[PDB]
Amino acid sequence: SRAEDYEVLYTIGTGRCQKIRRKSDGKILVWKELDYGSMTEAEKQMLVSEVNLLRELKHPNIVRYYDRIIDRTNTTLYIVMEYCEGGDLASVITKGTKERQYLDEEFVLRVMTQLTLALKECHRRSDLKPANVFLDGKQNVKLGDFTPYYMSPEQMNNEKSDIWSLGCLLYELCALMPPFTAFSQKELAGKIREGKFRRIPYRYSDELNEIITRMLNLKDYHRPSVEEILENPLILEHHHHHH
Ligand SMILES: COc1cccc(-c2cnc(N)c(N3CCC(C(=O)O)CC3)n2)c1
Ligand SMILES: [Cl-]
Ligand SMILES: [Cl-]
Ligand SMILES: [Cl-]
Numbered sequence: 001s002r003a004e005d006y007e008v009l010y011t012i013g014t015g016r017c018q019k020i021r022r023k024s025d026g027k028i029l030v031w032k033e034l035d036y037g038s039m040t041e042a043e044k045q046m047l048v049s050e051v052n053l054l055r056e057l058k059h060p061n062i063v064r065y066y067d068r069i070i071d072r073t074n075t076t077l078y079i080v081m082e083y084c085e086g087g088d089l090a091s092v093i094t095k096g097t098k099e100r101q102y103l104d105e106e107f108v109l110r111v112m113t114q115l116t117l118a119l120k121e122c123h124r125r126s127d128l129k130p131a132n133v134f135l136d137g138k139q140n141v142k143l144g145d146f147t148p149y150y151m152s153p154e155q156m157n158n159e160k161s162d163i164w165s166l167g168c169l170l171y172e173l174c175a176l177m178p179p180f181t182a183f184s185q186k187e188l189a190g191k192i193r194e195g196k197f198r199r200i201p202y203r204y205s206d207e208l209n210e211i212i213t214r215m216l217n218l219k220d221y222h223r224p225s226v227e228e229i230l231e232n233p234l235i236l237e238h239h240h241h242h243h
């Protein structure tokens with residue numbers, strides 16, 4: 001549990017995220033670097049609190065956080081977590097736009113199934129966007145992190161709010177653009193409150209279109225619950241995580 005136990009391979013993004021290798025057994029991991037040198041005792045206490053709660057989230061569809069490492073010489077805290085070799089979903093959407101190629105329905109069903117189960121676990125314990133959703137090396141989808149395109153009408157003015165955000169994310173995976181677009185937040189808010197959007201492309205089934213649309217209902221109480229989503233006939237065993 002010291003930084004010297006690991007070698008940095010390279011920087012993933014900029015605190016700063018780095019792919020690292022554990023020296024003892026060669027295991028590939030990543031860590032996030034948090035410089036706490038500019039923080040008050042009160043801000044460091046809330047940091048330690050947040051980090052200890054991260055450690056108890058064990059679920060196949062939530063990024064796994066293993067360890068935390070302190071380096072007082074640099075006032076740097078390192079959060080060691082699993083490595084998701086597939087990167088984030090935002091980059092998958094970007095790729096699709098550039099290649100002018102829509103994503104497979106099977107892929108969208110996997111994201112839906114696995115993110116719905118991550119949310120179910122989050123709700124049971126008590127920010128859904130493509131940049132916070134990660135892919136591993138075997139088609140598994142994991143929620144991480146922890147212009148407001150995905151802002152729900154009610155949050156504009158609740159576990160059903162998360163359903164709205166998943167609807168927006170799944171819609172963007174299919175259309176390669178969010179359901180509501182605009183140049184300012186006030187214009188965005190107008191579009192959102194009206195609750196109209198284009199059908200996802202026709203290569204996607206009426207059944208997939210229907211459930212996404214339901215998640216985007218203006219009335220939180222008409223959006224399907226996590227349990228109602230998972231009962232959908234589209235969602236099969238192979239859409240779930242597999243080790
Ligand atoms: C090029 O490969 C990439 C691209 C983008 C992200 C990643 C990646 C891989 N594994 C991770 N555990 C990871 N993180 C997911 C969790 C994030 C968080 O808790 O702040 C930090 C970044 N990102 C890899
Ligand atoms: Cl898994
Ligand atoms: Cl296209
Ligand atoms: Cl269309």
Ligand SMILES: [Cl-]
Pocket residue numbers: 238
């Ligand atoms: Cl199969």
